[PDB]
Design a protein around this nucleic acid. Sequence first.
RNA 1: CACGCUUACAUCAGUAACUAAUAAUAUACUGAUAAUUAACAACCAAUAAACCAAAACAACACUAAAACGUUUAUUAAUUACAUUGUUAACCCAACACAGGAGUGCACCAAGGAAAGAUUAAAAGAAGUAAAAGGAACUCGGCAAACACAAACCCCGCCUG
RNA 2: GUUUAAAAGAACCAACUCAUCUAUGUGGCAAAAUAGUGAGAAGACUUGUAGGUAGAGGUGAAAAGCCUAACGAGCCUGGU
RNA 3: ACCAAAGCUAGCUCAACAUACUAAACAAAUACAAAAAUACACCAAAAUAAAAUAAAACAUUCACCUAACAUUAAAGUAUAGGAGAUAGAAAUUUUUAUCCUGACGC
Lengths: 14, 26, 87, 46, 41, 97, 149, 122, 206, 179
Amino acid sequence: KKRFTPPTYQPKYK
Amino acid sequence: AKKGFRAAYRFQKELERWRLLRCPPP
Amino acid sequence: KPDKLPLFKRQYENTIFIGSKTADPLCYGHTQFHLLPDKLKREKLLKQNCADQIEVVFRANAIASLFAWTGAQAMYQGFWSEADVTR
Amino acid sequence: KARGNEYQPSNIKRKHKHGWVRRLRTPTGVQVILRRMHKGRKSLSH
Amino acid sequence: LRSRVTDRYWRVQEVLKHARHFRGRKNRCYRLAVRAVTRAF
Amino acid sequence: FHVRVTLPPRKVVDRWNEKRAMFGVYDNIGILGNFEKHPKELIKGPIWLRGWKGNELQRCIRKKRMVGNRMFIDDLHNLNKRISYLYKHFNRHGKYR
Amino acid sequence: ARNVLYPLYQLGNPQLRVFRTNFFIQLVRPGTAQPEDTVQFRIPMEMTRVDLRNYLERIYNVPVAAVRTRVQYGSNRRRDHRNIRIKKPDYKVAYVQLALGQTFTFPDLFPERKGASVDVDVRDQVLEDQRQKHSPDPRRGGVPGWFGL
Amino acid sequence: GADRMSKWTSKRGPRTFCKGRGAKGTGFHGRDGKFVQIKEMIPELVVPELAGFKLKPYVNYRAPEGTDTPLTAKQLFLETAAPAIEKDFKAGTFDPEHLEKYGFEPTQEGKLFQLYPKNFPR
Amino acid sequence: SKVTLPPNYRYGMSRPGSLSDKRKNPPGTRRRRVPVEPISDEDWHLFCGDKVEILEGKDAGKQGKVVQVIRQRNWVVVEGLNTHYRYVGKTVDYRGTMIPSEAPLLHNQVKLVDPTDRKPTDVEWRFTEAGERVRVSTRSGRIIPKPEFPRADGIVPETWIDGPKDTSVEDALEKTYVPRLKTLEEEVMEAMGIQETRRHKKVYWY
Amino acid sequence: GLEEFFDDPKNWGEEKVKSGASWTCQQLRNKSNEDLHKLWYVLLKERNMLLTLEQEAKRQRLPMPSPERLEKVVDSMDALDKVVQEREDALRLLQTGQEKARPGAWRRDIFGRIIWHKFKQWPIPWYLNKKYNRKRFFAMPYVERFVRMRIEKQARIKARKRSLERKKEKFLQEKFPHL
RNA sequence: CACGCUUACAUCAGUAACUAAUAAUAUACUGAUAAUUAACAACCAAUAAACCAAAACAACACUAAAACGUUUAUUAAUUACAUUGUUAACCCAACACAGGAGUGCACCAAGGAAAGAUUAAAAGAAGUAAAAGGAACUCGGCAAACACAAACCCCGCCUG
RNA sequence: GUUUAAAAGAACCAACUCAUCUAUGUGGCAAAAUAGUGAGAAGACUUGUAGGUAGAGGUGAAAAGCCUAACGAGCCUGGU
RNA sequence: ACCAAAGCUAGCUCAACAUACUAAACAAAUACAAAAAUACACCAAAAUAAAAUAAAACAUUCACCUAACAUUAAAGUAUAGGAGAUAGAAAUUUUUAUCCUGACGC
Ligand SMILES: [Mg+2]
Ligand SMILES: [Mg+2]
Ligand SMILES: [Mg+2]
Ligand SMILES: [Mg+2]
Ligand SMILES: [Mg+2]
Ligand SMILES: [Mg+2]
Ligand SMILES: [Mg+2]
Ligand SMILES: [Mg+2]
Ligand SMILES: [Mg+2]
Ligand SMILES: [Mg+2]
Ligand SMILES: [Mg+2]
Ligand SMILES: [Mg+2]
Ligand SMILES: [Mg+2]
Ligand SMILES: [Mg+2]
Ligand SMILES: [Mg+2]
Ligand SMILES: [Mg+2]
Ligand SMILES: [Mg+2]
Ligand SMILES: [Mg+2]
Ligand SMILES: [Mg+2]
Ligand SMILES: [Mg+2]
Ligand SMILES: [Mg+2]
Ligand SMILES: [Mg+2]
Ligand SMILES: [Mg+2]
Ligand SMILES: [Mg+2]
Ligand SMILES: [Mg+2]
Ligand SMILES: [Mg+2]
Ligand SMILES: [Mg+2]
Ligand SMILES: [Mg+2]
Ligand SMILES: [Mg+2]
Ligand SMILES: [Mg+2]
Ligand SMILES: [Mg+2]
Ligand SMILES: [Mg+2]
Ligand SMILES: [Mg+2]
Ligand SMILES: [Mg+2]
Ligand SMILES: [Mg+2]
Ligand SMILES: [Mg+2]
Ligand SMILES: [Mg+2]
Ligand SMILES: [Mg+2]
Ligand SMILES: [Mg+2]
Ligand SMILES: [Mg+2]
Ligand SMILES: [Mg+2]
Ligand SMILES: [Mg+2]
Ligand SMILES: [Mg+2]
């Protein structure tokens, strides 16, 4: 399968 | 805040030891 | 500033028209007739408390319309800013 | 081709799909508004 | 009754006092000092 | 492991206040009083625990049976889920079997 | 009037009359170049051109000719310490062109006083003299000048 | 995404979204598409004559105040109708069926400014 | 106008909406709560303007006049008794005017003094038979008058001149109300002679 | 009469402009309807002038001379409005008996809450209005759970507030042993 | 201009630090004060009847049979000034992103700057030129080229 | 625009729409791009706005494609 | 020596009692594209719970699972169950009024 892991951003208060 | 007096008194002893090692009395 | 007249800026086709295309053989004007609309009546101006503008509206209509006409005639003859009118 | 720009803003579609009237015209949207009110949301709809 | 450890300072010092003459992070970090002190003994 | 740098104020606890002086005063009420009232009646607390003791599953079962009709929605849901989890864990999980 | 319910009009209804108006207007200086016959007001959001015309013609008896209104939007960009937007309130700005040819000019409501300026200059001179007399003597080198010998 | 906390005004929509800012209507739409303004719908400011009015926006600082006595319905009745009805009952011509002579109004729909429907803004 | 304060607020002898207070604690701070003894308004005997005595401090046993009171922390300050010296004029190359400011005092550290014997007494609230509530002492057994203090505005009703936009006392106290059963609208209409003949149509309300 | 928006030209550069006290409810009640109707505009002109002066002070980055005049004028106009409304309330209670001057009804919207729906002026009856007919004043059977949830949430809030007050009282009694 | 974002726009002042992926300072940070003014645009009649005969310079035709309208009769409150949109260097993509974006005008009369300062190592990317040979390279003439032509099969009729 | 008695699902080639091949890029300008080169380009054509079809389903000139960056069956909440 | 470290409070948790249970604000505007005063209507709808799990698989079955009868016993009894996993009563019995409520909870 074409398995892709999307990136996760961080909260902007940090 | 940690509820306790033993640690506080032991650290008072440690502080006195550090003070004696820093400024040795005559 | 002219915006306090009030005048508003716009962008569309800027044309120089005398009333007919340049290929028309009658490229000169004789007399214009301008009927004032119902918004600029004497009664409406008196209600608006604008009595001294009863002549200002006529003067403005004339100064605008006749200048547009004569400028269209001059630019149809071939005169412009750098080729200023001779007659 | 390039993704990520799937949101094309338009106030008509916004208010017609997630508006107050759209939520209140159906019993499920009324339940949505009630759930948002129970949670205490500052904004119940668009 | 929440019970937390209050003498962890001395629990760590009793092990770090045997590593002060070491080289590298074994004389500072506790995770690396417990292993270096056991091998020392 | 940073321990506080100042001594805390010594709590002056008096072991001779009203509660500490009259604690457990009527524990022998039935024995020394021509038994009419069991020491159960001195237990102050929740209704489903006055003179009763059990494990967590029995506690939850008794609470739901006694005061379940007055609990809130989320509280009753959490109680039902705790009952289910304790049932499954105590009847299917463990080592000694 | 604002924040009040108006009677529904129908054919043959009486004339709507307001006895105690709830509108309060400010007279603001034009931020841009304005002609002589134009006055700039800040009016409530619920006030119309005819409402301001009647306001100026009845309460203050001003021969107005034209009224033009606009709605200025207040900024909602600044953030609080909680990162919450603080919105400046929107306001209605009206431009009133006078009728009889009267020329209005916003006056200088804060003219400076010559005596006040002279007093401020004297205070500045006294402060400078005090600083000069309190400045340390360079020939002493930090020795306190209070003790005599 | 768009913003939800900001107010939904007429400045934030398309050309076909023109929401008023709170002003009252002053007329209707005529025949040729223009707006016909009704002179009965525009508020007429009733301004009195302040020429010989000897009263200022502020009062004397040395002038004394009074104890708070909020005017009540019973006090108003005692001030306007109790003496008249008392005199009428002492004279013996009191009529319980007709109370219009003392100021009572049976139906509000007759007069111009009614109280319960509140036909007047201010 | 009234300013709003967070529940975790500290009173520091400054106005809650003053620049000094805004510099002391900006709107992002929430300090620890100080325990304040509960004293209702019916049990506060310490007012502004009376001669009180100090109990503890370096200047103990001395008497002074109350200048300000703070009910949120049970604080009172007297003028020039319990003082510390602070500089106000401060610049890059000049200082001066070291003024003695006053530190606040607690109701446990200050008690009211009777004007009769000039001795510290305890104050108790009593109800006299004439319908007044006057503070009565218990040590000697006398009453304490009310220390009338001038208001913070700085204007005295004894010496006051009416300006161009002020009404006289006669015009302010002139009673001209005729309590009849007409509204202000009908009164003004009948006064100005406005004649309205047509009446409203049927309006539905729902 | 466009100068009425400004004070006297001899009070323009003044630092402090003193004025009298504000109107109090008793002084307003002592006057008649004519004098109240006139004092309304007398105060309105002063309020407009003070607002103009405040905006001009903001523009010039200078403090407004004695800004308490605006507070006094607003307080006086509020007292006048309160007195006129009190007279209107007494008159309407004497004539009709209604407490409120606008018709309304205690309704129950679709959200289960109990609201006070005020009435609007319509030229047609209620059974012929499209915009009014598509409104619902009643709750469906799925709103009872949300009503009970609101009840329980408010009960929990009140309970924890009462517990907080009790704990604060106990802490204060333990900190101050003056008993 | 439309759609969209809402003041990020304008004036003055400051930038030690915060935003600009660095400075200078400032349309992008901070504070105060001001602003977008209707003629353009939005909201801006129903009820019956006469009405088959396309738009494409529309003369007249083709097939795929084609949006866009007047007149007549009955009622349409009638009386200046109603309300709302008017800034921007901007929108959607985590960003001051080499990407995605409808329409009418012109190809400059309007917009901007590829290089922070040096040296001219290797390797890498882009380009130009090259003796003699001209596919001998390579899976394949891929790529490139002063060439930019002619044929033979397999599979799909073809456009899509 | 050019060739055509042609607006011929004709031809050359712009705007425009796709994405054949190669080289860079591969935490990059970019969670699919840049440069060169390509295919269509009056039509079964591109495209603006607004509405509809909703997951035991919709839609599909069947790639088991697409249905808000992971679809042999979306995501969120609850069962948990 | 920097970076840093330590406070004791804000408040929460579990119960008891309890009036008897959708707080306060509701001037105007708010189910037109919510907070937009103002025109001849249409308004409303119900049809079982399922499955994840256990039966070491999975097909009949699988306590609780947002429906009041509480407590002491009968009793985990009679019974119901691929008679397996498990489920599970009743007849009949006991239950004395109020304060003494706070916390070996953070
Ligand atoms: Mg996204
Ligand atoms: Mg406008
Ligand atoms: Mg959002
Ligand atoms: Mg709009
Ligand atoms: Mg727009
Ligand atoms: Mg008009
Ligand atoms: Mg944005
Ligand atoms: Mg920088
Ligand atoms: Mg700025
Ligand atoms: Mg513009
Ligand atoms: Mg270079
Ligand atoms: Mg450059
Ligand atoms: Mg460079
Ligand atoms: Mg090289
Ligand atoms: Mg090369
Ligand atoms: Mg070459
Ligand atoms: Mg060669
Ligand atoms: Mg070969
Ligand atoms: Mg080879
Ligand atoms: Mg090739
Ligand atoms: Mg070739
Ligand atoms: Mg070739
Ligand atoms: Mg093919
Ligand atoms: Mg063929
Ligand atoms: Mg072709
Ligand atoms: Mg390409
Ligand atoms: Mg090349
Ligand atoms: Mg190309
Ligand atoms: Mg081609
Ligand atoms: Mg081809
Ligand atoms: Mg749709
Ligand atoms: Mg299946
Ligand atoms: Mg399917
Ligand atoms: Mg296939
Ligand atoms: Mg396949
Ligand atoms: Mg997805
Ligand atoms: Mg199984
Ligand atoms: Mg298993
Ligand atoms: Mg299996
Ligand atoms: Mg299985
Ligand atoms: Mg089940
Ligand atoms: Mg059987
Ligand atoms: Mg088996």
